[PDB]
């Protein structure tokens, strides 16, 4: 059983997809805090140009506002709204 | 407004589609050139449920693909490469 050239190569083609991202990663100012989940699900450029003077760059993004925990360990928790970059096209372009 | 639970439960620890560079499961085969030069794999991603553990498969297998195989100064064909994937994971603790 094996995966056909063209499909690979159709799959794996730069373009947004799903992509587990760390929070304090995107927010490294809220170091007192812990958030949870600590990552969310946001959509990303990611895949190949297949071509070494290519990148797969966003061509079009906009924001996510997700329901996040924040906890201060031993002390309390709160569920407040946190906004996050998402792409929402991609291409391949010129480095 | 993305709710809580359903972020929480989309992030946790599982396998996901990951696009990951050839070069990276072949590190051996840096004298080669791949098109594509990536594949879509199922790879253990998102968080556990704190910093003290890490989210590791629990089941894995092959899968295996055609990959046009590239030396400039030999030739080209597209041959069969395996790739590892993860079919199940868990968060267990860090080892350090």
Do not use: A, W
């Not at 996510?64 to 970059?85: A, N, V, Y």
């Amino acid at each position: 059983e094996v995966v056909k050239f063209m499909d690979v190569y159709q799959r794996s083609y730069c373009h947004p997809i799903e992509t587990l991202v760390d929070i304090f990663q995107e927010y490294p100012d809220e170091i007192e805090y812990i958030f949870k989940p600590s990552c969310v699900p946001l959509m990303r450029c990611g895949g190949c140009c297949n071509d070494e003077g290519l990148e797969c760059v966003p061509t079009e993004e906009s924001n996510i506002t997700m329901q996040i925990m924040r906890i201060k360990p031993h002390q309390g928790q709160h569920i407040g709204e946190m906004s996050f970059l998402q792409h929402n096209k991609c291409e391949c372009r010129p480095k």
